[PDB]
Curated annotation (Swiss-Prot), chain F:
Species of the source: Human rhinovirus C (strain C15) (HRV-C15)
First and last residues shown, out of full length: 135 to 200 of 2153
Annotated protein name in UniProt: Capsid protein VP2
Secretion signal span: none
Described function: Forms an icosahedral capsid of pseudo T=3 symmetry with capsid proteins VP2 and VP3. The capsid is 300 Angstroms in diameter, composed of 60 copies of each capsid protein and enclosing the viral positive strand RNA genome.
Quaternary organization: Interacts with capsid protein VP1 and capsid protein VP3 in the mature capsid. Interacts with host CDHR3 (via N-terminus); this interaction occurs near each threefold vertex of the capsid and allows the virus attachment and entry into the host cell.
Cellular localisation: Virion; Host cytoplasm
Disulphide linkage map: none
Amino acid sequence: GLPTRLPSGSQQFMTTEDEQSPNILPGFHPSKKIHIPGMITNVMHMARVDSFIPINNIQGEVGKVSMYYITVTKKTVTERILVLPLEMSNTLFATTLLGEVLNYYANWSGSITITFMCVCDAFSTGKFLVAYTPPGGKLPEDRKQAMLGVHIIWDLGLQSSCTIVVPWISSGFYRRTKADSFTHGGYVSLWYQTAFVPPVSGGTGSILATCSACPDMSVRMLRDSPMMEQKNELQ
Amino acid sequence: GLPTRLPSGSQQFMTTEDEQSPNILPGFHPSKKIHIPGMITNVMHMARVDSFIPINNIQGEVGKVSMYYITVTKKTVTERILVLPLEMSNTLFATTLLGEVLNYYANWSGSITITFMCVCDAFSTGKFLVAYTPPGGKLPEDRKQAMLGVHIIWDLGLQSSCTIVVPWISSGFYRRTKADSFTHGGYVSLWYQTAFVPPVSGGTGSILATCSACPDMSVRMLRDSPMMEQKNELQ
Amino acid sequence: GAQVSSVIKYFNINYYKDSASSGLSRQDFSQDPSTLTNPALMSPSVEACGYSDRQITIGNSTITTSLHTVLAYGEWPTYLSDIDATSVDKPTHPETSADRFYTLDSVEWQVGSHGWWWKLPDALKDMGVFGQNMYYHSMGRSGFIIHTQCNATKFHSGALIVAVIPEHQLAYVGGVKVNVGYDHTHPGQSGHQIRGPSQSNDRSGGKPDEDPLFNCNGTLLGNITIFPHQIINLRTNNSSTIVVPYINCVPMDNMLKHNNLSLVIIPLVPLRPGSSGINSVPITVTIAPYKSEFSGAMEAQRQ
Amino acid sequence: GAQVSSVIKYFNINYYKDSASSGLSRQDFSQDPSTLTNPALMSPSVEACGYSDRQITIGNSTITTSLHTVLAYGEWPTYLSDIDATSVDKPTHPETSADRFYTLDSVEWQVGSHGWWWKLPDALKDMGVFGQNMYYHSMGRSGFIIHTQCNATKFHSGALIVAVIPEHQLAYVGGVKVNVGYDHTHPGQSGHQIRGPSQSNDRSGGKPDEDPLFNCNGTLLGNITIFPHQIINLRTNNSSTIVVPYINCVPMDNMLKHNNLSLVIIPLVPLRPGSSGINSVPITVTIAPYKSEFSGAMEAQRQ
Amino acid sequence: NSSTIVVPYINCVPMDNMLKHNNLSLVIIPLVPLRPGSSGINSVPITVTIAPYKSEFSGAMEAQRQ
Amino acid sequence: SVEWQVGSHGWWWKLPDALKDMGVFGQNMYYHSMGRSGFIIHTQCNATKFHSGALIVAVIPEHQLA
Amino acid sequence: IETRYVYNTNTNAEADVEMFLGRSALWGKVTLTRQYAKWEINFQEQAHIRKKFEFFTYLRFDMEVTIVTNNKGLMQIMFVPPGIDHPETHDDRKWDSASNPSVFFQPKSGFPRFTIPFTGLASAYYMFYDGYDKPKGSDNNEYGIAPTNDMGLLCFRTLDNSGGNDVKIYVKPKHITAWVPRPPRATQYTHKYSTNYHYKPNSSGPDEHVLKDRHFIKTRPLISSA
Amino acid sequence: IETRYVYNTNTNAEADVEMFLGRSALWGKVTLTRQYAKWEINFQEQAHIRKKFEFFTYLRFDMEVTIVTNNKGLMQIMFVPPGIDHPETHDDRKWDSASNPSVFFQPKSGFPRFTIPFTGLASAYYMFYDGYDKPKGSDNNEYGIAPTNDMGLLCFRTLDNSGGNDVKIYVKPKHITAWVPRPPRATQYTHKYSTNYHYKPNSSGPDEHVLKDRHFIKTRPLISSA
């Protein structure tokens, strides 16, 4: 009758295709849909929520709650307190809401948002330099080379100055989630602007850090997250 | 239901067909398209660009830069300096932008454009006869038989007279790219109109030649260019 | 067929005539075209919708603190109304007698204290005429207001995470396949002190997981911020308030069997005394049932 | 299905509802119907678009010669503007301090000299405050103006080919599989004198191909005319000028790692002295960064 | 704890060398000494952060650097 | 940063000089004959409520040393 | 009729829950040994697809099931609704059913596909359920989502034995509505329907009862040196 | 709806870059030995199709992939997006993927075909790239277009062994946009991702290290006598 043709890719079965299918159980009446609080229509809105970065992950501290905070004390000369190499495949970011939404997608774009929170007493005071070195730069090794990039001065007694927004600085339009020398995104490092001055000598600070996506974050090419592995069948 | 029929050539797979295909990776967002200089929408516009003909290709000169130029001196009697048998399969044309675009197509039409350029000092002067013998004629063997075809007198000290436009003179509408006695396109030969007179006896001229397509050039029936061969796998 | 009642149009067609036989769901438009954040998540400020509903007083008990209240999922608690309800039977509203602040046993927060959790409504089962209406009714729904209050001096230090997890399903303390016991996940008002992790923790009778880092369910802390939460930092604030609506698939559930919330309090950073000599501080929790409804009255389900 | 938003009509239909699932691309028309040359190629005369932008002076340095300037790909250099740019961060425009003519080391053109090449921006990396802005910035883009000037007398003879190759990827000097070294393809201002071909040319450390006929990349000379080029014939003209925009897929690239141009100068016909006794003549190259932009400031990438 | 000062360009000349002529000085004098309290901290860092603002350069040449 | 101690008499910085090696400002000094700039000086010293003492942060145009 | 404009792609359209979960993945494998095979419909078995549904506390979705078999010549699938007895063998009289929906296919022709609409009974599926089916004193209390539903089961027989025995069930959640977001799981699943992460590697001999987390966090030598 | 007039043919419509490159050609051959095969997607392997893309410095195109296999009975292809680990064997647990797109087919039914849109990450594909991925002093610098992208890879397994082992991947560039024209290559490729033409014929014994151009220019006895 009608001259149809079946091209290549007709009798194919593609996992990712979109096709209508016959309904077994016809006339079945689905139970009514009430109003449940918290509907989420998109999985990027999970990446938008702050989540603590395991900034202390070392031999002893991994697997414990102490893996989330860094100890700062008063020191005579500036030191480099912390370095957060910017990759969504790295344990620092990969284990957060941001990084573990982005490890389903093969590359991304937009700005990271990194907030710091110091847990100390009310009498302590400090000035910290938070510096993002763009792609292509070395990790600074001293504060005079860290200050020449993007940086903010995080001052205690404000907590409006905590958040640094890692800008999007890239050649290409997207950055690969898996760290590689071509697209590598740079380094966020933490320094002592002045000092952490406790109310009494020998005092101790404790620093936490969070990461979330900025509204211009975007991702593409959904894939298998490295963040799950099944080595034996579930029974 | 609907009486469809599948004719012959339905479940076929044709390399050269045109068919829509399902998109693996749906919802994938292509990176934005910026403005890059130099867009080329058609491959005939490469054939339009002048390119040097290897007019000196002989035992010793092939593989070197000297393969592109002919030496002319002052001679008492006219000689035939150069012959460019007009075929797009011939090493002369086949290796240029013109000829190597046309070796993808099984036959062609339109006018070739051949420009000559003499590299000498400013005190040298010369008159050259550039003659195209149409299809069916013998190669002239003397200037009085070369002048009776299409010809131009290329004079130094002008460089408006360099270009000869090989006209399209053919029985059929198209000419086969691979030289054969039926469609053969003729001969462009170079002669001494008067002489090449150097500023001092023993002087030496050097002649280069280019070829490009005219705007009425056309090609058809894309095929495998003889200009590439893979004799072993690339690893 | 059927249909139904850089920009690509398409004819909406069900080839199989039915819904749910249809393909995947996109976003339609009637005419040509020619979103980034969800404020419901991120735990709004209860002023980020409206403050007219709130100095906080429910049902004969007063809280004086309310811009820093987090409104869970940006939804204010409300009665089941209709059209979302299964039974037509008129629920009971106890209002101010069973909707009031119930303060629980305080818990010492020490150095080395791993955390605490309370299941809701369960924590309130013996509390007042709310805890009476649980037993005498088949079903029920309630929204809650959790006020967590821990006060130390300017010399002290350390932070807590006060989070409310909908459907917090505990992991068994280890090894083989066992359901955690009904009794260990229904501790009462005393809640559960997280005493682990250790390889020596007792495994019997389905005891729940004692590891605070994995949230006892196997998911990290620091991602616990996806739930409604507040962080109490003794450098900044001493207290917390969280307003949760009724989260569940069902309009009303049993309240004895199903605990649809969990109040988890984790010492994110330990408690360090300053020059002061105080090594431990009480943490107090005050829960208010709010917009609670009960239906299906019977004999007390009490054993 | 979908569609989208001797003469044969057709109903435009995407059977699979998507772009890029569509078939091959033809040239549409809305109503019935009832091209031969590309001037962007063929290296226009910079008057063939407009001469108002040009006696040639950029940024405090003067060239006096400009109908014979070739405008590469018929496009005049211009700033990245917007909407083609990735980052919103405002680039830096050095303008007349870093946009100026930088004259490089002259090179003797002799009998037997095979050729020369310079990589860009690389040749300018130590030159002035252009070469400073490379190191202190993540990215950058620049258009260039190449002025090649070789003067001999009316007794001399011989011709050069001055070509600008976008993305000129050198071949390794022979044999096995090796990437040419970072150092041999980044020679600095001195460029690279082509000393080959020979079977005796050294093979080590990824040295580039020395054969001028194959363009060091394996493609013949005489087809090198497809790029922007000029032919300097000592019988006619002594100099050359080429105006290249910024050619690249990316809005801005590193400039230290990626050399997006090459200036190749090939003695197409050798240099023959006349009655004169001068066996060699200098060739001088003068490069002007033009419409250069830098962004992503950091510590100097300098080692 | 901190300070901010915004200086225009003060000089008789529109532009001067900047290598030879220093047209400003930032002086920080401990007017009253630093006494620790009950705390045991005997010294505190002072940090200075300078931003060139509305800077102009002219007369380009080879680097005057030695 | 500079330690502020008991007995520390003061500090001074000359401008633009302090910035001569700093970034692409300190590059433009050398490659240009002349230049002018305004500056923004942010001086930041943080101690606790137990500490004491005061600084004078002053900007002197044309401070000619003895 | 209606022309229904959408778009080609938007920025994050990769990430919306419809596209995130809207790929057809393997929810279980069975073998036809004896010519009979049976699979109770669940996503609990496969850890990768299980981890994605568990970003969310509640899901409401249709599912379409696609059966990829290396067997040949003919097959029958029977969807057995809850509350009755399924066929226990081939040549079982219960393969003759006036009512239970079943689907015949010849595996060399195509891949059979059907749709199971939302059966949830609760208005959404519980991914995590904090409560018990039986009351307090009851002796055997199932904890979690196991009592909250059953999505049926699929019985497979082979009328012509022919080729391989391996059946694969790929299902695609469609028309998804997801509600309360949860932290991604940080640890490898050790059971079905159970949220416990402690592995218990060994059984028979000594050094038993030491058990592992199997988490995905890995260390770095020094903070600040990264 | 819209009636979209074009033409039958125009003069040079054979030569426009859409028709020039718009034929489906073989980009690689693999063998199913062990029932597993793997191919990293590239055009570098086949010298004829490689020479045509290299008239142009930059290309932006979709590609549709068509798999021609002489095997039978069933097969799976898995497109593995960059940045993860592909299945290394058949019967590998990584063939069960909630996310990685895969396509099942029975080779005797038809030829499977799908489309990979433009993934280039750069706004166009580099045919030739003059720069390095790592900075100056870095020890291992890849030169050329190898770091600039990866188009993924295709993993093949066979669920029913049956017939031959030979897989052929034909892809068709479609929706092509080509930018900077280059000279056609004059010389036979000796490597992948590398532009070097020197052949180095021998290995083991004497007369090693003499290497050939392998160009296509051939001579004539006399100029002027042609």
